[PDB]
């Protein structure tokens, strides 16, 4: 059909994808054991996109979980939906990276990548017509930020035409937990820009802000963060999995969302988030969804788009609606906030409609935006990387792995060319 293989890297990736798989199992009516339990026939029509068939009316996720540290695999297996994953797909090493991108990328990742490649090649030859791969990982880690990039670089060579999505977790400078984090981020953004079709930058600080303000949760743990990420990933492909008035998919979004191959960083958003008190005084309406989304507080990246130009905007709605109101709202937000949009692309908003709402909810909307505000993260990462790399601090850890010193310089050059190019496109009048 149109299948997706879910690549999983790091503790971030493993927990996030566990939440994501559990969530989409709730959408397709899949039990912890594996069988089907749903009521409607549409709930089981296109489940082969993510699931593979096994005897007994059983479905296994199309997931490949990779980690250099074995202790996360036990927690994943003992999680709520720990049964559902076939344990051949689990690929683990014996020694981790120790938050070292170089160790994840050169030294120890080379011994696990053959096995991971064999697993993903088996899974790719399983499905007849694969749309592409979708990877979750963290940029501040050692395996996802590290070995994940090597995996990407090999599979881009292996299957060039297939789509390549990454729900990447970029580090936050305001709240950080790793000292050597900027080195890994700088060394992995280069691989991201070279070999990736689309990226979604997800910020844990932004998720914390959303939980603190929008939902007012007293104690939002990492589970609610992964819940929000899973909302985003489900809302990306809900229209692929379920029919709607105006259909779309990953390539429908990517072709319309990437004007130039160097520009594939996106800011995702999810509309229906209200507190328990705010549930009392509200109205489920398309204008309210549009406003709640277009507020910058709802944003789950770490940049304010009011400081950028929206290159292009994507709105994918979930649930049955009237298209008059959604087209009226998108045209209105285009006209009213006129100069936040670039002038060299007309009708910057692309819309999609899926009839089936998410389970237990009448209405929802998701969003993917390419804007100029995303370079604000790269500038700050570059600033901290310069401040660290001037003094050759923490450099022996990376140097003992056998790599030279020109790689930092070339990664910095690529990142600076990226930010210069984005700013040049921002400051670009068209003459006609």
């Amino acid at each position: 059909m149109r299948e997706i293989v879910h690549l999983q890297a790091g503790q971030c990736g493993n927990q996030i994808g566990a939440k994501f798989w559990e969530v989409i199992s709730d959408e397709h009516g899949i039990d912890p054991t594996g069988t089907y339990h749903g009521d409607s026939d549409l709930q089981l029509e296109r489940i082969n996109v993510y699931y593979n068939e096994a005897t007994g009316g059983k479905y296994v996720p199309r997931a490949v979980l990779v980690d250099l540290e074995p202790g996360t695999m036990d927690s994943v297996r003992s999680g709520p939906f720990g049964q559902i994953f076939r344990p051949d797909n689990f690929v683990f090493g014996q020694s981790g990276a120790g938050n070292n991108w170089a160790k994840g990328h050169y030294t120890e990742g080379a011994e696990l990548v053959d096995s991971v490649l064999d697993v993903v090649r088996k899974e790719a030859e399983s499905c007849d017509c694969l749309q592409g791969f979708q990877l979750t990982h963290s940029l501040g880690g050692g395996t996802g930020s590290g070995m994940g990039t090597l995996l990407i670089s090999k599979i881009r060579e292996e299957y060039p035409d297939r789509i390549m999505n990454t729900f990447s977790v970029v580090p936050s400078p305001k709240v950080s937990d790793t000292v050597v984090e900027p080195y890994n981020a700088t060394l992995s953004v280069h691989q991201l820009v070279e070999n990736t079709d689309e990226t979604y930058c997800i910020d844990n600080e932004a998720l914390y802000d959303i939980c603190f303000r929008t939902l007012k949760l007293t104690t939002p743990t990492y589970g609610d963060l992964n819940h929000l990420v899973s909302a985003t990933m489900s809302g990306v492909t809900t229209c692929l999995r379920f029919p709607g008035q105006l259909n779309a998919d990953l390539r429908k979004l990517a072709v319309n969302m990437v004007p130039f191959p160097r520009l594939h960083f996106f800011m995702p958003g999810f509309a229906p988030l209200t507190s328990r008190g705010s549930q009392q005084y509200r109205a489920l309406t398309v204008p309210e969804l549009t406003q709640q989304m277009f507020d910058a507080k709802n944003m789950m990246a770490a940049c304010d788009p009011r400081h950028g130009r929206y290159l292009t905007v994507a709105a994918v709605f979930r649930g049955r609606m009237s298209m008059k109101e959604v087209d009226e709202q998108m045209l209105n937000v285009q006209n009213k906030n006129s100069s936040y949009f670039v002038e060299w692309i007309p009708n910057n908003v692309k819309t999609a409609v899926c009839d089936i709402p998410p389970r237990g909810l009448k209405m929802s909307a998701t969003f993917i935006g390419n804007s100029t505000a995303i370079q604000e993260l790269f500038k700050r990462i570059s600033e901290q990387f310069t401040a660290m790399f001037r003094r050759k601090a923490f450099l022996h850890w990376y140097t003992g792995e056998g790599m030279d010193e020109m790689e930092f310089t070339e990664a910095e050059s690529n990142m600076n060319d990226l930010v210069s190019e984005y700013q040049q496109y921002q400051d670009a009048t068209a003459e006609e």
Binding site: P70, G71, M73, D74, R77, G82, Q83, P87, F92
Partner: peptide, 21 residues
């Protein structure tokens, strides 16, 4: 309590129960 039944490979392991047999 750190349960390493799943992480332990088939060599160098005892007959301790893994999850979901």
């Amino acid at each position: 309590r750190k349960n390493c039944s799943f992480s332990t490979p088939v060599p160098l392991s005892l007959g301790q129960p893994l999850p979901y047999e």
